[PDB]
mmCIF file of all heavy atoms in Angstrom:
data_model
loop_
_atom_site.group_PDB
_atom_site.id
_atom_site.type_symbol
_atom_site.label_atom_id
_atom_site.label_comp_id
_atom_site.label_asym_id
_atom_site.label_seq_id
_atom_site.Cartn_x
_atom_site.Cartn_y
_atom_site.Cartn_z
ATOM 1 N N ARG A 63 15.667 -10.886 -15.727
ATOM 2 C CA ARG A 63 15.265 -9.492 -15.869
ATOM 3 C C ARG A 63 13.778 -9.389 -16.198
ATOM 4 O O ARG A 63 13.324 -8.401 -16.777
ATOM 5 C CB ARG A 63 16.095 -8.811 -16.960
ATOM 6 C CG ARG A 63 15.836 -7.319 -17.099
ATOM 7 C CD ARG A 63 17.113 -6.513 -16.938
ATOM 8 N NE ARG A 63 16.882 -5.083 -17.124
ATOM 9 C CZ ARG A 63 17.789 -4.138 -16.889
ATOM 10 N NH1 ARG A 63 18.998 -4.464 -16.451
ATOM 11 N NH2 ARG A 63 17.484 -2.864 -17.090
ATOM 12 N N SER A 64 13.021 -10.418 -15.827
ATOM 13 C CA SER A 64 11.578 -10.422 -16.034
ATOM 14 C C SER A 64 10.830 -10.465 -14.705
ATOM 15 O O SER A 64 9.730 -9.928 -14.586
ATOM 16 C CB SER A 64 11.168 -11.615 -16.898
ATOM 17 O OG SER A 64 9.771 -11.614 -17.137
ATOM 18 N N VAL A 65 11.429 -11.107 -13.705
ATOM 19 C CA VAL A 65 10.825 -11.186 -12.381
ATOM 20 C C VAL A 65 11.036 -9.883 -11.612
ATOM 21 O O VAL A 65 10.175 -9.464 -10.840
ATOM 22 C CB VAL A 65 11.421 -12.350 -11.564
ATOM 23 C CG1 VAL A 65 10.743 -12.456 -10.206
ATOM 24 C CG2 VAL A 65 11.293 -13.660 -12.329
ATOM 25 N N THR A 66 12.184 -9.249 -11.830
ATOM 26 C CA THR A 66 12.489 -7.977 -11.181
ATOM 27 C C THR A 66 11.764 -6.817 -11.856
ATOM 28 O O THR A 66 11.418 -5.831 -11.209
ATOM 29 C CB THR A 66 14.003 -7.686 -11.198
ATOM 30 O OG1 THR A 66 14.460 -7.577 -12.552
ATOM 31 C CG2 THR A 66 14.771 -8.793 -10.490
ATOM 32 N N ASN A 67 11.542 -6.940 -13.162
ATOM 33 C CA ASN A 67 10.848 -5.909 -13.927
ATOM 34 C C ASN A 67 9.378 -5.800 -13.527
ATOM 35 O O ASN A 67 8.785 -4.722 -13.587
ATOM 36 C CB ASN A 67 10.961 -6.200 -15.423
ATOM 37 C CG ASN A 67 10.683 -4.979 -16.278
ATOM 38 O OD1 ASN A 67 10.204 -3.958 -15.786
ATOM 39 N ND2 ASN A 67 10.991 -5.078 -17.566
ATOM 40 N N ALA A 68 8.795 -6.920 -13.112
ATOM 41 C CA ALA A 68 7.407 -6.938 -12.670
ATOM 42 C C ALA A 68 7.320 -6.334 -11.278
ATOM 43 O O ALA A 68 6.489 -5.464 -11.018
ATOM 44 C CB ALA A 68 6.865 -8.357 -12.671
ATOM 45 N N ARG A 69 8.184 -6.803 -10.384
ATOM 46 C CA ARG A 69 8.280 -6.242 -9.043
ATOM 47 C C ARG A 69 8.597 -4.756 -9.141
ATOM 48 O O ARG A 69 8.253 -3.978 -8.252
ATOM 49 C CB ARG A 69 9.362 -6.964 -8.242
ATOM 50 C CG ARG A 69 8.950 -8.349 -7.781
ATOM 51 C CD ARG A 69 10.107 -9.101 -7.148
ATOM 52 N NE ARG A 69 9.685 -10.399 -6.627
ATOM 53 C CZ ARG A 69 10.514 -11.332 -6.170
ATOM 54 N NH1 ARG A 69 11.824 -11.125 -6.171
ATOM 55 N NH2 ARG A 69 10.031 -12.481 -5.718
ATOM 56 N N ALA A 70 9.264 -4.373 -10.224
ATOM 57 C CA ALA A 70 9.599 -2.979 -10.475
ATOM 58 C C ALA A 70 8.367 -2.198 -10.895
ATOM 59 O O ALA A 70 8.166 -1.067 -10.465
ATOM 60 C CB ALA A 70 10.671 -2.873 -11.542
ATOM 61 N N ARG A 71 7.546 -2.798 -11.751
ATOM 62 C CA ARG A 71 6.336 -2.137 -12.216
ATOM 63 C C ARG A 71 5.419 -1.880 -11.021
ATOM 64 O O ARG A 71 4.786 -0.826 -10.918
ATOM 65 C CB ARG A 71 5.588 -3.004 -13.231
ATOM 66 C CG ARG A 71 4.950 -2.214 -14.358
ATOM 67 C CD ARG A 71 3.594 -2.760 -14.767
ATOM 68 N NE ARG A 71 3.385 -4.165 -14.422
ATOM 69 C CZ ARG A 71 3.535 -5.181 -15.267
ATOM 70 N NH1 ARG A 71 3.905 -4.967 -16.521
ATOM 71 N NH2 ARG A 71 3.316 -6.419 -14.850
ATOM 72 N N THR A 72 5.372 -2.851 -10.111
ATOM 73 C CA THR A 72 4.499 -2.788 -8.942
ATOM 74 C C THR A 72 4.958 -1.724 -7.958
ATOM 75 O O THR A 72 4.202 -0.817 -7.611
ATOM 76 C CB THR A 72 4.457 -4.143 -8.204
ATOM 77 O OG1 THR A 72 3.984 -5.163 -9.092
ATOM 78 C CG2 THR A 72 3.543 -4.072 -6.991
ATOM 79 N N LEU A 73 6.205 -1.836 -7.518
ATOM 80 C CA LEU A 73 6.770 -0.868 -6.592
ATOM 81 C C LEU A 73 6.591 0.531 -7.165
ATOM 82 O O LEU A 73 6.325 1.479 -6.431
ATOM 83 C CB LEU A 73 8.251 -1.170 -6.344
ATOM 84 C CG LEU A 73 8.979 -0.373 -5.255
ATOM 85 C CD1 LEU A 73 9.361 1.028 -5.723
ATOM 86 C CD2 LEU A 73 8.138 -0.303 -3.983
ATOM 87 N N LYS A 74 6.734 0.651 -8.481
ATOM 88 C CA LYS A 74 6.550 1.929 -9.160
ATOM 89 C C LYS A 74 5.112 2.420 -9.027
ATOM 90 O O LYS A 74 4.874 3.602 -8.796
ATOM 91 C CB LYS A 74 6.919 1.814 -10.640
ATOM 92 C CG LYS A 74 8.327 2.282 -10.956
ATOM 93 C CD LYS A 74 8.579 2.306 -12.454
ATOM 94 C CE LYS A 74 9.990 2.774 -12.778
ATOM 95 N NZ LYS A 74 10.259 4.156 -12.290
ATOM 96 N N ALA A 75 4.155 1.510 -9.187
ATOM 97 C CA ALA A 75 2.743 1.864 -9.084
ATOM 98 C C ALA A 75 2.404 2.373 -7.689
ATOM 99 O O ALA A 75 1.621 3.309 -7.539
ATOM 100 C CB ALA A 75 1.874 0.668 -9.428
ATOM 101 N N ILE A 76 2.994 1.753 -6.671
ATOM 102 C CA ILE A 76 2.734 2.131 -5.287
ATOM 103 C C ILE A 76 3.313 3.505 -4.971
ATOM 104 O O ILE A 76 2.616 4.381 -4.460
ATOM 105 C CB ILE A 76 3.341 1.105 -4.311
ATOM 106 C CG1 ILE A 76 2.665 -0.258 -4.482
ATOM 107 C CG2 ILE A 76 3.190 1.577 -2.873
ATOM 108 C CD1 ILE A 76 3.432 -1.406 -3.850
ATOM 109 N N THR A 77 4.589 3.686 -5.289
ATOM 110 C CA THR A 77 5.321 4.901 -4.941
ATOM 111 C C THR A 77 4.879 6.109 -5.766
ATOM 112 O O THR A 77 5.274 7.240 -5.482
ATOM 113 C CB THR A 77 6.841 4.702 -5.130
ATOM 114 O OG1 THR A 77 7.549 5.823 -4.584
ATOM 115 C CG2 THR A 77 7.184 4.550 -6.603
ATOM 116 N N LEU A 78 4.062 5.873 -6.785
ATOM 117 C CA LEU A 78 3.594 6.951 -7.647
ATOM 118 C C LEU A 78 2.760 7.957 -6.863
ATOM 119 O O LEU A 78 2.904 9.166 -7.035
ATOM 120 C CB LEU A 78 2.771 6.386 -8.806
ATOM 121 C CG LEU A 78 2.164 7.426 -9.748
ATOM 122 C CD1 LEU A 78 3.256 8.189 -10.478
ATOM 123 C CD2 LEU A 78 1.215 6.767 -10.731
ATOM 124 N N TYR A 79 1.885 7.451 -6.000
ATOM 125 C CA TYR A 79 0.974 8.307 -5.251
ATOM 126 C C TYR A 79 1.621 8.883 -3.991
ATOM 127 O O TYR A 79 1.110 9.837 -3.405
ATOM 128 C CB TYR A 79 -0.298 7.538 -4.899
ATOM 129 C CG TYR A 79 -1.095 7.125 -6.115
ATOM 130 C CD1 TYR A 79 -0.921 5.876 -6.691
ATOM 131 C CD2 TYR A 79 -2.013 7.991 -6.694
ATOM 132 C CE1 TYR A 79 -1.647 5.497 -7.806
ATOM 133 C CE2 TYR A 79 -2.743 7.621 -7.806
ATOM 134 C CZ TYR A 79 -2.556 6.373 -8.358
ATOM 135 O OH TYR A 79 -3.280 6.002 -9.467
ATOM 136 N N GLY A 80 2.744 8.305 -3.582
ATOM 137 C CA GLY A 80 3.516 8.835 -2.472
ATOM 138 C C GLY A 80 2.809 8.713 -1.138
ATOM 139 O O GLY A 80 1.992 7.816 -0.938
ATOM 140 N N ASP A 81 3.135 9.625 -0.224
ATOM 141 C CA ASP A 81 2.574 9.620 1.124
ATOM 142 C C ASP A 81 1.053 9.750 1.102
ATOM 143 O O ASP A 81 0.364 9.261 1.999
ATOM 144 C CB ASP A 81 3.177 10.758 1.948
ATOM 145 C CG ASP A 81 4.648 10.542 2.254
ATOM 146 O OD1 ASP A 81 5.265 9.658 1.621
ATOM 147 O OD2 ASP A 81 5.188 11.259 3.122
ATOM 148 N N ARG A 82 0.540 10.419 0.075
ATOM 149 C CA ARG A 82 -0.897 10.602 -0.086
ATOM 150 C C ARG A 82 -1.618 9.260 -0.004
ATOM 151 O O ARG A 82 -2.753 9.182 0.462
ATOM 152 C CB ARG A 82 -1.186 11.269 -1.433
ATOM 153 C CG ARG A 82 -2.619 11.731 -1.632
ATOM 154 C CD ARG A 82 -2.743 12.542 -2.916
ATOM 155 N NE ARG A 82 -4.028 13.229 -3.026
ATOM 156 C CZ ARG A 82 -4.262 14.469 -2.604
ATOM 157 N NH1 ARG A 82 -3.301 15.185 -2.029
ATOM 158 N NH2 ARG A 82 -5.468 14.999 -2.754
ATOM 159 N N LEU A 83 -0.945 8.205 -0.457
ATOM 160 C CA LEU A 83 -1.505 6.858 -0.431
ATOM 161 C C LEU A 83 -1.292 6.184 0.920
ATOM 162 O O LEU A 83 -2.217 5.598 1.480
ATOM 163 C CB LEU A 83 -0.869 6.002 -1.528
ATOM 164 C CG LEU A 83 -1.282 4.528 -1.543
ATOM 165 C CD1 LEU A 83 -2.749 4.387 -1.903
ATOM 166 C CD2 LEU A 83 -0.411 3.741 -2.508
ATOM 167 N N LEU A 84 -0.071 6.265 1.438
ATOM 168 C CA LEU A 84 0.266 5.601 2.690
ATOM 169 C C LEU A 84 -0.554 6.159 3.850
ATOM 170 O O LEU A 84 -0.772 5.473 4.847
ATOM 171 C CB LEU A 84 1.762 5.730 2.993
ATOM 172 C CG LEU A 84 2.724 4.843 2.193
ATOM 173 C CD1 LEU A 84 2.391 3.370 2.381
ATOM 174 C CD2 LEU A 84 2.725 5.206 0.714
ATOM 175 N N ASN A 85 -1.005 7.403 3.721
ATOM 176 C CA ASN A 85 -1.855 8.010 4.740
ATOM 177 C C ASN A 85 -3.180 7.273 4.878
ATOM 178 O O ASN A 85 -3.474 6.695 5.923
ATOM 179 C CB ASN A 85 -2.127 9.478 4.410
ATOM 180 C CG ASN A 85 -1.006 10.392 4.857
ATOM 181 O OD1 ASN A 85 -0.349 10.139 5.867
ATOM 182 N ND2 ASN A 85 -0.787 11.469 4.110
ATOM 183 N N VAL A 86 -3.972 7.293 3.812
ATOM 184 C CA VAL A 86 -5.302 6.700 3.830
ATOM 185 C C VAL A 86 -5.270 5.270 4.358
ATOM 186 O O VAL A 86 -6.172 4.845 5.076
ATOM 187 C CB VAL A 86 -5.928 6.690 2.425
ATOM 188 C CG1 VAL A 86 -7.289 6.008 2.457
ATOM 189 C CG2 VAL A 86 -6.056 8.108 1.889
ATOM 190 N N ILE A 87 -4.227 4.531 4.002
ATOM 191 C CA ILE A 87 -4.105 3.142 4.422
ATOM 192 C C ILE A 87 -3.730 3.065 5.894
ATOM 193 O O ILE A 87 -4.136 2.143 6.595
ATOM 194 C CB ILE A 87 -3.060 2.383 3.577
ATOM 195 C CG1 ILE A 87 -3.484 2.369 2.107
ATOM 196 C CG2 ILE A 87 -2.896 0.959 4.082
ATOM 197 C CD1 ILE A 87 -2.459 1.766 1.170
ATOM 198 N N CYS A 88 -2.962 4.041 6.361
ATOM 199 C CA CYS A 88 -2.481 4.024 7.735
ATOM 200 C C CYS A 88 -3.571 4.408 8.728
ATOM 201 O O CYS A 88 -3.799 3.700 9.709
ATOM 202 C CB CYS A 88 -1.284 4.957 7.894
ATOM 203 S SG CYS A 88 0.284 4.229 7.370
ATOM 204 N N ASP A 89 -4.269 5.507 8.462
ATOM 205 C CA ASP A 89 -5.269 5.994 9.408
ATOM 206 C C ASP A 89 -6.548 5.155 9.371
ATOM 207 O O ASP A 89 -7.440 5.344 10.194
ATOM 208 C CB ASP A 89 -5.580 7.478 9.173
ATOM 209 C CG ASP A 89 -5.958 7.777 7.740
ATOM 210 O OD1 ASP A 89 -6.576 6.907 7.090
ATOM 211 O OD2 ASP A 89 -5.636 8.887 7.264
ATOM 212 N N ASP A 90 -6.632 4.230 8.419
ATOM 213 C CA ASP A 90 -7.674 3.209 8.444
ATOM 214 C C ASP A 90 -7.228 2.067 9.338
ATOM 215 O O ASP A 90 -8.051 1.396 9.956
ATOM 216 C CB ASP A 90 -7.974 2.676 7.042
ATOM 217 C CG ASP A 90 -9.085 3.439 6.353
ATOM 218 O OD1 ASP A 90 -9.741 4.266 7.019
ATOM 219 O OD2 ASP A 90 -9.311 3.207 5.146
ATOM 220 N N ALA A 91 -5.919 1.847 9.404
ATOM 221 C CA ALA A 91 -5.366 0.802 10.253
ATOM 222 C C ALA A 91 -5.582 1.185 11.709
ATOM 223 O O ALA A 91 -5.507 0.346 12.607
ATOM 224 C CB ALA A 91 -3.885 0.598 9.961
ATOM 225 N N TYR A 92 -5.841 2.469 11.930
ATOM 226 C CA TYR A 92 -6.166 2.971 13.255
ATOM 227 C C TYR A 92 -7.415 3.838 13.192
ATOM 228 O O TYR A 92 -7.354 5.051 13.397
ATOM 229 C CB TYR A 92 -4.990 3.760 13.822
ATOM 230 C CG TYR A 92 -3.812 2.881 14.143
ATOM 231 C CD1 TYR A 92 -2.669 2.908 13.360
ATOM 232 C CD2 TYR A 92 -3.848 2.011 15.223
ATOM 233 C CE1 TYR A 92 -1.594 2.102 13.647
ATOM 234 C CE2 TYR A 92 -2.778 1.201 15.519
ATOM 235 C CZ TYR A 92 -1.654 1.250 14.725
ATOM 236 O OH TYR A 92 -0.573 0.451 15.005
ATOM 237 N N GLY A 93 -8.545 3.202 12.902
ATOM 238 C CA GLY A 93 -9.814 3.894 12.812
ATOM 239 C C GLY A 93 -10.911 3.115 13.508
ATOM 240 O O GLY A 93 -10.652 2.094 14.145
ATOM 241 N N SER A 94 -12.143 3.597 13.376
ATOM 242 C CA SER A 94 -13.284 2.965 14.022
ATOM 243 C C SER A 94 -13.556 1.584 13.437
ATOM 244 O O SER A 94 -13.466 0.576 14.138
ATOM 245 C CB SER A 94 -14.526 3.845 13.876
ATOM 246 O OG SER A 94 -14.783 4.138 12.514
ATOM 247 N N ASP A 95 -13.884 1.546 12.149
ATOM 248 C CA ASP A 95 -14.237 0.298 11.481
ATOM 249 C C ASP A 95 -13.165 -0.763 11.702
ATOM 250 O O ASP A 95 -11.994 -0.549 11.393
ATOM 251 C CB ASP A 95 -14.437 0.535 9.984
ATOM 252 C CG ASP A 95 -15.005 -0.677 9.274
ATOM 253 O OD1 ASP A 95 -14.753 -1.809 9.738
ATOM 254 O OD2 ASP A 95 -15.702 -0.498 8.253
ATOM 255 N N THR A 96 -13.576 -1.910 12.235
ATOM 256 C CA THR A 96 -12.651 -2.995 12.539
ATOM 257 C C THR A 96 -12.362 -3.841 11.303
ATOM 258 O O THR A 96 -11.217 -4.205 11.042
ATOM 259 C CB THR A 96 -13.209 -3.910 13.641
ATOM 260 O OG1 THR A 96 -14.491 -4.412 13.243
ATOM 261 C CG2 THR A 96 -13.347 -3.147 14.950
ATOM 262 N N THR A 97 -13.406 -4.153 10.542
ATOM 263 C CA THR A 97 -13.254 -4.953 9.333
ATOM 264 C C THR A 97 -12.321 -4.260 8.342
ATOM 265 O O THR A 97 -11.708 -4.907 7.492
ATOM 266 C CB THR A 97 -14.612 -5.203 8.649
ATOM 267 O OG1 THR A 97 -15.235 -3.950 8.337
ATOM 268 C CG2 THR A 97 -15.529 -6.012 9.556
ATOM 269 N N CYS A 98 -12.215 -2.942 8.462
ATOM 270 C CA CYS A 98 -11.374 -2.155 7.572
ATOM 271 C C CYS A 98 -9.924 -2.119 8.042
ATOM 272 O O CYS A 98 -9.003 -2.283 7.244
ATOM 273 C CB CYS A 98 -11.914 -0.730 7.467
ATOM 274 S SG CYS A 98 -10.957 0.354 6.388
ATOM 275 N N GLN A 99 -9.719 -1.903 9.336
ATOM 276 C CA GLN A 99 -8.369 -1.759 9.868
ATOM 277 C C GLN A 99 -7.567 -3.050 9.726
ATOM 278 O O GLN A 99 -6.338 -3.019 9.685
ATOM 279 C CB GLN A 99 -8.404 -1.319 11.335
ATOM 280 C CG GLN A 99 -8.877 -2.390 12.298
ATOM 281 C CD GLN A 99 -8.988 -1.883 13.720
ATOM 282 O OE1 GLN A 99 -8.600 -0.753 14.021
ATOM 283 N NE2 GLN A 99 -9.523 -2.717 14.605
ATOM 284 N N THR A 100 -8.257 -4.182 9.651
ATOM 285 C CA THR A 100 -7.575 -5.453 9.442
ATOM 286 C C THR A 100 -7.033 -5.515 8.019
ATOM 287 O O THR A 100 -5.861 -5.816 7.805
ATOM 288 C CB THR A 100 -8.505 -6.651 9.688
ATOM 289 O OG1 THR A 100 -9.095 -6.543 10.989
ATOM 290 C CG2 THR A 100 -7.728 -7.954 9.600
ATOM 291 N N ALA A 101 -7.889 -5.218 7.047
ATOM 292 C CA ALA A 101 -7.477 -5.208 5.648
ATOM 293 C C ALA A 101 -6.327 -4.230 5.437
ATOM 294 O O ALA A 101 -5.423 -4.481 4.640
ATOM 295 C CB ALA A 101 -8.650 -4.845 4.754
ATOM 296 N N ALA A 102 -6.369 -3.115 6.158
ATOM 297 C CA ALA A 102 -5.358 -2.075 6.026
ATOM 298 C C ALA A 102 -4.015 -2.519 6.599
ATOM 299 O O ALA A 102 -2.970 -2.285 5.996
ATOM 300 C CB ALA A 102 -5.826 -0.801 6.708
ATOM 301 N N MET A 103 -4.043 -3.157 7.764
ATOM 302 C CA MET A 103 -2.815 -3.602 8.411
ATOM 303 C C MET A 103 -2.152 -4.704 7.589
ATOM 304 O O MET A 103 -0.927 -4.785 7.502
ATOM 305 C CB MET A 103 -3.109 -4.108 9.823
ATOM 306 C CG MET A 103 -1.867 -4.457 10.627
ATOM 307 S SD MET A 103 -0.766 -2.898 11.035
ATOM 308 C CE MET A 103 -1.986 -1.959 12.228
ATOM 309 N N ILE A 104 -2.974 -5.550 6.979
ATOM 310 C CA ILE A 104 -2.469 -6.618 6.130
ATOM 311 C C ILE A 104 -1.837 -6.035 4.868
ATOM 312 O O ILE A 104 -0.768 -6.472 4.438
ATOM 313 C CB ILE A 104 -3.592 -7.598 5.743
ATOM 314 C CG1 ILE A 104 -4.095 -8.339 6.983
ATOM 315 C CG2 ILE A 104 -3.097 -8.592 4.714
ATOM 316 C CD1 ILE A 104 -5.362 -9.133 6.750
ATOM 317 N N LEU A 105 -2.497 -5.041 4.279
ATOM 318 C CA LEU A 105 -1.985 -4.406 3.072
ATOM 319 C C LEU A 105 -0.620 -3.782 3.329
ATOM 320 O O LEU A 105 0.297 -3.941 2.529
ATOM 321 C CB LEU A 105 -2.959 -3.346 2.557
ATOM 322 C CG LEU A 105 -2.499 -2.580 1.313
ATOM 323 C CD1 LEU A 105 -2.260 -3.521 0.137
ATOM 324 C CD2 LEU A 105 -3.515 -1.514 0.942
ATOM 325 N N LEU A 106 -0.487 -3.069 4.442
ATOM 326 C CA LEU A 106 0.789 -2.462 4.805
ATOM 327 C C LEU A 106 1.864 -3.533 4.925
ATOM 328 O O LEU A 106 2.946 -3.412 4.349
ATOM 329 C CB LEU A 106 0.669 -1.703 6.127
ATOM 330 C CG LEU A 106 -0.178 -0.432 6.086
ATOM 331 C CD1 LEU A 106 -0.326 0.146 7.485
ATOM 332 C CD2 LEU A 106 0.427 0.597 5.137
ATOM 333 N N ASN A 107 1.557 -4.586 5.674
ATOM 334 C CA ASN A 107 2.482 -5.698 5.841
ATOM 335 C C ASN A 107 2.928 -6.250 4.491
ATOM 336 O O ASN A 107 4.077 -6.656 4.326
ATOM 337 C CB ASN A 107 1.829 -6.802 6.673
ATOM 338 C CG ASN A 107 2.833 -7.808 7.195
ATOM 339 O OD1 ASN A 107 3.995 -7.481 7.425
ATOM 340 N ND2 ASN A 107 2.384 -9.041 7.395
#
């Protein structure tokens, strides 16, 4: 109950901002800057 609690803290941190967060990361994955869209696609993965 310590390994799941950490993964829980993390998943919680991500889902806190909701779609507002997944947007910025997504439309960078499909934007002009190439060095950025790579970091974005990796983050999503």
